[PDB]
Design a protein around this ligand. Structure first.
Ligand SMILES: O=C(O)CNC(=O)C(=O)O
Ligand SMILES: [Fe+2]
Ligand SMILES: [Fe+2]
Ligand SMILES: [Zn+2]
Ligand SMILES: [Zn+2]
Length: 447
């Protein structure tokens, strides 16, 4: 009668859902949580020694650093192989690079001027900087709010996604362990936390997104509360990163627009305009084999450097390509949102993600689902407008049009089989597309 199979110091049966590491001495497996080993520490450990074996054999044999410019710091430091994104060398070169200032393109405003009316008239296609919090409708915890407070409200046991910046790889850690790492001024490595959405926590109550984001948001205006699909929550993110954290050039999921507020620290955004040329080069680079070794800021004509100091708020429009460097230990708040000002661009970005085979976890939850809802709503808003002697605004027309082309396409015989589980259970696809084309045709005639 053999003894039931158990592992680790806790002598528990295997649990394929928990992170484990193997002792090179006893050949047993251990829960990282039981022996104090984080998922990100695994790659640094060559041959692991559990606490028990270490007493007579010493601590784990760690891998040896031979360079400062590659994701694999063990590689010999000769001359072959270029500098990779996120490494110490990369950061040193980035800090000394010369960029045109973002002052050349962004718009500095007062919160009271940033309205829907203002964006419909001047458009929302260049980053907007709002230095003072006044009139934005943005509520945040006081400037004294610290990472320890985040733990206090969110709870130390929550599992968050962390990024090992020098490897440009991610893993999971408890908030408790992350705050513990952040509080020690002596960091063994650079770790960044960029996707801690807290709408579902006690912390959600301390934040109220900017009025302008709430006013324009698709989810805020067109997503039915009674829908069967789980409402997408990408409205409240808490960002924590130590000095030298770095996120490479990308375009927000679903072509969303974003707002960022630095509570303390300093962040530097490298902005690239979404011209057709830039978007093309971006998709090439994004899918290239040498991506990690090419600074995208060198593949375009202008890469603007935007310093966002604590207390400031930045809004970045649809499709803009940007990278971010954490200049100082930083805590920030931000959120994403879709709107009617640049539907075409939003759809363009969605399609690019499909081609690039972007993982489901890195996209706007129910993008097509919300696109149907919006179309259904805009059809009515368009009728009512004409049924009152009014000429719909050009951008809205061009937008609803772009949405028409997209919708029609998602139904094509060969395609329809995919964008199926996405179509909300209360809209008539064909009917909708038809009623749309009709109204578009009218405005395109009686105007
Ligand atoms: O974490 C940062 O400094 C910047 N993050 C992002 O732009 C993002 O998560 O999409
Ligand atoms: Fe060993
Ligand atoms: Fe971003
Ligand atoms: Zn052992
Ligand atoms: Zn255990």
């Amino acid at each position: 009668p053999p003894p039931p199979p158990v592992y680790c110091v806790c002598r528990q049966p295997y649990d394929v859902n928990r992170f484990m590491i193997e002792c090179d001495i006893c050949k047993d497996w251990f829960h990282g949580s039981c022996v104090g080993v984080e998922e990100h520490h695994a790659v640094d450990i060559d041959l692991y020694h559990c606490p028990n074996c270490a007493v007579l054999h010493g601590s784990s044999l760690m891998k040896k650093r031979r360079n400062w410019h590659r994701h694999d710091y063990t590689e010999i430091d000769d001359g072959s192989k270029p500098v990779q994104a996120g490494t110490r060398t990369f950061i040193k070169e980035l800090r000394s690079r010369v960029f045109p200032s973002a002052d050349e393109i962004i718009i500095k405003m007062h919160g009271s001027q940033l309205t829907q009316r203002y964006l419909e008239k001047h458009g929302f296609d260049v980053p907007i900087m709002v230095p003072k919090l006044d009139d934005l409708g943005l509520r945040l915890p006081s400037p004294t709010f610290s990472v320890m407070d985040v733990e206090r409200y969110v709870g130390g046991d929550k599992v968050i996604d962390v990024i090992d910046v020098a490897r440009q790889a991610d893993s999971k850690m408890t908030l408790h362990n992350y705050v513990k790492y952040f509080m020690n001024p002596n960091r063994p490595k650079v770790l960044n936390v960029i996707s801690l959405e807290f709408s579902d926590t006690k912390m959600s109550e301390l934040v109220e997104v900017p009025d302008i984001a709430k006013k324009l948001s698709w989810v805020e205006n067109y997503w039915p509360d009674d829908s069967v699909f789980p409402k997408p929550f990408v409205q409240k993110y808490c960002l924590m990163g130590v000095q030298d954290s770095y996120t490479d050039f990308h375009i927000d999921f679903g072509g969303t627009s974003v707002w960022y507020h630095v509570l303390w620290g300093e962040k530097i955004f490298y902005l690239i305009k979404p011209t057709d040329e830039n978007l093309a080069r971006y998709e090439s680079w994004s899918s290239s084999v040498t991506q990690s070794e090419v600074f995208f800021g060198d593949k375009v004509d202008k890469c603007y450097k935007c310093v966002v100091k604590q207390g400031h708020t930045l809004f970045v429009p649809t499709g803009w390509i940007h990278a971010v460097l954490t200049s100082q230990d930083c805590m920030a708040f931000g959120g994403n949102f879709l709107h009617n000002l640049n539907i075409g661009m939003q759809l363009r970005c969605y399609e690019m993600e499909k081609r690039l085979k972007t993982p489901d976890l890195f996209k706007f939850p129910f993008f097509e689902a919300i696109c149907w809802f919006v179309a259904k709503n805009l059809l009515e808003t368009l009728k009512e407008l004409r049924e009152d002697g009014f000429q719909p605004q050009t951008y809205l027309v061009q937008g609803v049009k772009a949405l028409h082309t997209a919708l029609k396409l998602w139904m094509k015989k060969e395609l329809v089989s995919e964008h199926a589980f996405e179509i909300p259970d209360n809209v008539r696809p064909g009917h909708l597309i038809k009623e749309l084309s009709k109204v578009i045709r009218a405005i395109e005639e009686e105007n």
